[model samples]
Target: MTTKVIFTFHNPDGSPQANEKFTVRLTRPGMSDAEHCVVIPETYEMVTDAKGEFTMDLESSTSAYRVTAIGDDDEYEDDPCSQYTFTFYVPDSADPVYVQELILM
Candidate 1:
């Protein structure tokens, strides 16, 4: 399966940030409860291209993908104790897994 995320930085008041470094982590669900709970099995670094977009093609399956976009690759940007989890599912009937512009905002 292929997955992509578009992240936009924001100020304290929630304005867009022109230039900044960020990172995204993708993980599975329910794994966080285990002793060695692997929160993130894969990670992608966000690099602002000319258009100010960090793109990545994930070689993953249809399982749920948990994503987090953090400022400056610092996990602190996103509330560690309070993380937003989104679930994406792909059906076997679909020809191929596909996803377009999905926003966390």
Candidate 2:
């Protein structure tokens, strides 16, 4: 089973970061690949749409999960917004997964 997780980026000045590439790297191992095969490394590259939304379907699991950005990956930090990462578990709604950016309720 997989849970759909949507991510949208907002600028400090209240603007959407459209048409940008980012990676959703796992800080720790998550999900079991026994049922299916997906080339999921620590780095799962993704891009934002015109509305600044990145949709990902992660494998649902009982184990806790933590993912973050690849800071200092580029020459000048291309996807700077991803610097602030999030921690979450599967079997959850997509809306709240993103809401955990501030680690809030």
Best-matching candidate per lDDT: 2
- In candidate 2, how many Å is residue 94 off? 9.1
Encode model 1's per-residue lDDT on 1-105: one tens digit a residue: 333544343445654555555454544533322342333456656555444555554434444554454332236457455544344542233233344334564
Listed per candidate, the RMSD to the true structure in angstroms reads: 8.8, 5.8
> What lDDT tens digits, residue by residue, belong to model 2 across residues 1-105?
455666666764887766766655544444554663333445656567777776677645444455553244434656555356566655443333455432767
Error of 1 at 39 (Å): 14
Clashes (N, CA, C under 3 Å) per candidate: 0, 0
Residue 44 CA displacement from its true place in model 1, Å = 3.0
Q: Pick the candidate with the highest TM-score.
A: 2
Ten-residue stretch with the least lDDT total in model 1: 89-98
